[PDB]
């Protein structure tokens, strides 16, 4: 009997947590590990310290069939310790279930550890506000059973389906907001169902690591001394945070880039609606997938210091390097930001906007008139 740990995430936030789990378990050099983290490359000089370390691409939110070749190397009874993105859990586990079916006598699922993609889970949950949540859970459990028995995916409620894994496996959920499950009264049956199977994402985990593990972790997430030194400047700091679009449409991507540059100007120019003051040093923390939208800010802004877009914002909180003020388009990063540091959060374009509702529920935004980015004069 042998445990194999899989770390799967096409996004950022679950991978960030999973790399913490790997760091905590980094003394064990031989434990079989499969990394399917789209946004993170484990440095070679770390890879070389480990045996039984494997890598798999994700395509369409699941491990490719390359997974099967890796698993074939382990010919005995194997138990899978699987780490997943919640929003994408059903697809990510699909090839794992298919492999289990082919080797039903030797392959088992030990447990699941699941982490929020980010704001998406909460925006999705907000849309379920008028449903009988208790009934949705019971139906999702039944349809999960069919998935597990047949390999066929069919959920009447794809959103609630993300939360019923306990009906089949030992599970632990790691939520960006545990407050949401307390504050959204319509979700009470889900809170109660999830019982003792969840905790909040622990942003104090880094602080409890040894100095050696802290250095190891920072190497995994792409943090380095130069970014550290850039943020240790003796001046008040403002970080402008970027967003992205998943649309490939040039019109849409150019629109996003232009509108986001205009937003930055509203923060940093004296005439801007959101003017922060002349004494701040300005940084840009682009979205990890901003791509040319990121480039547009760096090319068209002035006196801005880039924080490499691949560095997740929450690392600055872990390292105690948060700036005085943070502003930009609504992002998952605002879910764990101390409220005193929020300048303004801007929504893309509506009181009943589900993202607005989520943040209002959570006390991240107040009762004032929300700001959409197309409400801003082109400066
Ligand atoms: C509602 C919805 O669809 N939410 C998804 C969200 O759950 C997740 F898929 C992600 O989350 P998103 O809120 O962008 O932020 C996710 C994480 O990326 C890092 N980050 C982000 C922005 C930034 N300027 N600096 C950073 O470092 C932080 O670690 C943060 O916690 C994502 O791509 O991972 O993208 C959004 C949207 O699809 C996207 O914003 C397009 O508008
Ligand atoms: O990168 C992780 C995020 O992916 C989003 O899906 C995008 C995808 O990134 C993009 O390449 C293309 O395939 O369009 C998808 C949207 O339909 C997820 O929606 C988001 O939750 C993150 O997981």
Automatic annotation (TrEMBL):
Binding site for CMP 1: 242, 285, 287, 312-314, 331-332
Transmembrane portions of the chain: none
InterPro entries from the UniProt entry: PM0188 (IPR021574), Sialyltransferase_N (IPR043078)
Record's signal peptide: none
Keyword set, alphabetical order: Coiled coil, Glycosyltransferase, Transferase
Source organism, top-level taxon: Bacteria
Binding site for CMP 2: 242, 285, 287, 331
Pfam families: PM0188
UniProt feature coiled coil, ranges: 123-150
One GO MF term: glycosyltransferase activity
Name of the protein in question: Alpha-2,3/2,6-sialyltransferase/sialidase
Originating species: Pasteurella multocida
């Amino acid at each position: 009997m042998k445990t194999i740990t899989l770390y799967l995430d096409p996004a950022s936030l679950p991978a960030l947590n999973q790399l913490m789990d790997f760091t905590q378990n980094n003394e064990d050099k031989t434990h079989p590990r499969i990394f399917g983290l789209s946004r993170f490359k484990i440095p070679d000089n770390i890879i070389t310290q480990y045996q039984n370390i494997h890598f798999v691409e994700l395509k369409d939110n699941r491990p490719t069939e390359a997974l099967f070749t890796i698993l074939d190397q382990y010919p005995g009874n194997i138990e899978l310790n699987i780490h997943l993105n919640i929003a994408h859990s059903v697809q990510l586990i699909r090839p794992i279930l298919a492999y289990r079916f082919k080797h039903l006598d030797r392959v088992s699922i030990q447990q699941l550890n699941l982490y929020d993609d980010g704001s998406m889970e909460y925006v999705d949950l907000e849309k379920e506000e008028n449903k009988d949540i208790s009934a949705e859970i019971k139906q999702a459990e039944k349809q999960l059973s069919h998935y597990l028995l047949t390999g066929k995916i069919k959920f009447d409620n794809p959103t609630i389906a993300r939360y019923v894994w306990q009906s089949a496996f030992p599970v632990k959920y790691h939520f960006l907001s545990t407050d949401y499950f307390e504050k959204a009264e319509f979700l009470q049956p889900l809170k109660e169902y999830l019982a003792e199977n969840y905790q909040k994402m622990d942003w104090t985990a880094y602080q409890q690591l040894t100095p050696e593990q802290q250095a190891f972790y920072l190497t995994l997430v792409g943090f380095n001394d130069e970014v550290k030194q850039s943020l240790e400047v003796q001046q008040a700091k403002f970080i402008f945070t970027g967003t992205t679009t998943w649309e490939g449409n040039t019109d849409v991507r150019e629109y996003y880039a232009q509108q986001q540059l205009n937003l930055l100007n509203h923060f940093t120019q004296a005439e801007g609606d959101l003017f922060i003051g002349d004494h701040y040093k300005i940084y840009f923390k682009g979205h990890p997938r901003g791509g040319e939208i990121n480039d547009y800010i760096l090319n068209n802004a002035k006196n801005i210091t880039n924080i490499p877009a691949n560095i997740s914002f929450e690392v600055l909180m872990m390292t105690g390097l948060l700036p005085d003020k943070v502003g930009g388009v609504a992002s998952s990063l605002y879910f764990s930001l101390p409220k005193e540091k929020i300048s303004h959060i801007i929504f893309t374009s509506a009181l009943n906007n589900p993202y607005v509702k989520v943040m209002r529920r959570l006390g991240i935004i107040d009762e004032s008139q929300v700001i959409f980015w197309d409400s801003l004069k082109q400066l």
